[PDB]
Amino acid sequence: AGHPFGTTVTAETLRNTFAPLTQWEDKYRQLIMLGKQLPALPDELKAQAKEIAGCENRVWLGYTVAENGKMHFFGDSEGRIVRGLLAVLLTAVEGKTAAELQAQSPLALFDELGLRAQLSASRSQGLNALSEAIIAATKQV
């Protein structure tokens, strides 16, 4: 269930890493490299994840809550770009209480990385679906 995002990889290392990349294709590649750091979710735990759907790809997204209220998220995806975008989202949300996550948008980091400006429109529906799954999970907790 475990992954590096939030712990060994953070919003500020993503920011420092993406900031130099001015060619958008370099952002794209960084996005893909980032998603290769996401470990494979075994079919076992894809079943305990809610299936979220964009316009081209599926993502799986689960969560647990420690007793101190912190939420651990986990997920997987088949497309490499979508694995990158999911890694960015996990970096944004991992380790936060339900209270802390209803404070800003889950997708603010995608803007901060310069990623939204050039992604296809179709991505926005999957991103927005991810955002509302997070919002919904904080509602359940």
Author numbering: 7 to 147
From the paper:
In order to shed light into the consequences of oxidation inactivation of the redox-sensitive sulfur acceptor CsdE, we determined the crystal structure of a disulfide-bridged CsdE dimer at 2.4 Å. We used single-wavelength anomalous diffraction at the selenium absorption edge (Se-SAD) to phase selenomethionyl-labeled CsdE crystals that diffracted to 2.95 Å, and performed phase extension in nearly isomorphous native CsdE crystals to 2.4 Å. The final model contains nearly all CsdE residues except for the first 7−8 amino acids, which were disordered. It consists of a two-layered α/β-sandwich with a central three-stranded antiparallel β-sheet (βA-βC), surrounded by seven α-helices (α1-α7); the reactive sulfur acceptor Cys61 is located at the tip of an extended β-hairpin between βA and βB. The disulfide bridge has a favorable stereochemistry and is well defined in electron density maps. In the disulfide-bridged dimer, the two CsdE subunits are related by a pure rotation around an axis running parallel to the CsdE long molecular axis through 141°. The fifth largest interface, at 393 Å2 or merely 5.4% of a monomer’s ASA, includes the disulfide bond that creates this inactive CsdE species. However, in the disulfide-bridged CsdE structure this secluded orientation is obviously not possible; instead, the loop containing Cys61 has turned around to expose the thiol sulfur atom for disulfide bond formation. Indeed, the dimeric Cys61 conformation is roughly halfway between the fully protected and the completely exposed conformations, thereby representing an intermediate state. A remarkable observation made in the CsdE dimer is that, while Cys61 presents a fully exposed state as in persulfurated (CsdA-CadE), helix α7 is essentially unchanged with respect to the free forms of CsdE, and it is only slightly tilted to make way for the outward-going Cys61 loop.
